[PDB]
A paper describes a structure:
Argonautes can be classified into two major clades: AGO and [name]. The [name] clade, on the other hand, is restricted to animals and further confined to the gonads, often displaying strong sex-specific expression patterns. Together with their 24- to 30-nt [name]-interacting RNAs ([name]), they control transposon activity and are essential for fertility in animals. Argonautes are structurally organized into N-terminal, PAZ, middle ([name]), and [name] domains.
To extend these studies, we crystallized the [name] domain (S480-E616) of mouse [name], which binds primary [name] with a strong 1U-bias (∼90%). The final structure was refined to 2.3 Å-resolution using the native data. The overall structure of the [name] [name] domain reveals a Rossmann fold composed of alternating β-strands and α-helices that form a pocket capable of accommodating a single nucleotide. The [name] [name] domain is characterized by a core four-stranded β-sheet flanked by four α-helices. It strongly resembles those found in prokaryotic and eukaryotic AGO proteins; nevertheless, the superimposition of [name] and hAgo2 [name] domains highlights differences in the orientation of several secondary structural elements and loops. Comparison of the [name] [name]-UMP docking structure to that of hAgo2 [name]-UMP shows that a group of conserved residues allow interaction with the 5′ phosphate group ([name] residues: Y569, K573, Q585, and K604) and stacking of the base with a tyrosine (Y569 in [name]). The main difference occurs in the position of the specificity loop, which forces the base to change orientation. The specificity loop in [name] [name] lacks prolines and is consequently more flexible, explaining the repositioning of the base. Docked AMP can also enter the binding pocket and makes a stacking interaction with Y569 but fails to engage N564 in the specificity loop via hydrogen bonding, as seen with docked UMP. Thus, our docking studies suggest that the [name] [name] domain can optimally accommodate a 5′ uridine in the nucleotide-binding pocket, conferring an inherent ability to the protein in accumulating 1U-containing RNAs.
Numbering used by the authors:
A (entry chain C): 485 to 610
B (entry chain A): 486 to 612
The structure:
Amino acid sequence: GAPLISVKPLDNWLLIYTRRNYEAANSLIQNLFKVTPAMGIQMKKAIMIEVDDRTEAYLRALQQKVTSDTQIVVCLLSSNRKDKYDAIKKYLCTDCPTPSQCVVARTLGKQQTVMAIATKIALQMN
Amino acid sequence: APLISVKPLDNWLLIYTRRNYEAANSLIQNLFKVTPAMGIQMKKAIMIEVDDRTEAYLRALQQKVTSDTQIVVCLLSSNRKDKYDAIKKYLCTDCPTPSQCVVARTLGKQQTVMAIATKIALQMNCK
């Protein structure tokens, strides 16, 4: 036979992060692996993009890596630094057609933060 | 004391223009119908009538969106690209509260209603 239960594969997506948060990025992938089956989603590993911690490096990585095939984009930020956050958000929102979201590394400890992120992804996949 | 847990949706905004006053009322009623199956207990939206121009939508947003606002829904007279794009962009850059735009025309389907409610159930779990 072959599966009967609907899943949605999340196989092509970007996680853009800065070296200081290398391990909070890895943990996020694992955690999302845990909560994602309950939501009808089958996850592959994110395409991971390490950038210098500056606005412009995030934006470059965006212009170079986002494709037709990219399903979701997640920008992990070192900090809730208003200007950096606002300038990435503005660009994703005007220039990036691919659904996206920003996350501040700090909040990542919490399992409610993880759930919210996955929820937003489930949402963007429709 | 009532044992089944429900997510109350008691503070939220519907911004619409006078021409779609009734399509707006209907949308509330219909959402009342399909929302209990999703674990949500709905109150009526705070309804905000605005003139049919981009800027009027944006003023309403700046004035009425609060810490308490759970969801924002902008119902548009038309799929007019510029108006739709400008409102979408602004919500997306300047409005932290989760939101969506709906074109009145499409409200004439129970699949449209389901999609909006689905999106809301989803937005009720976000940071």
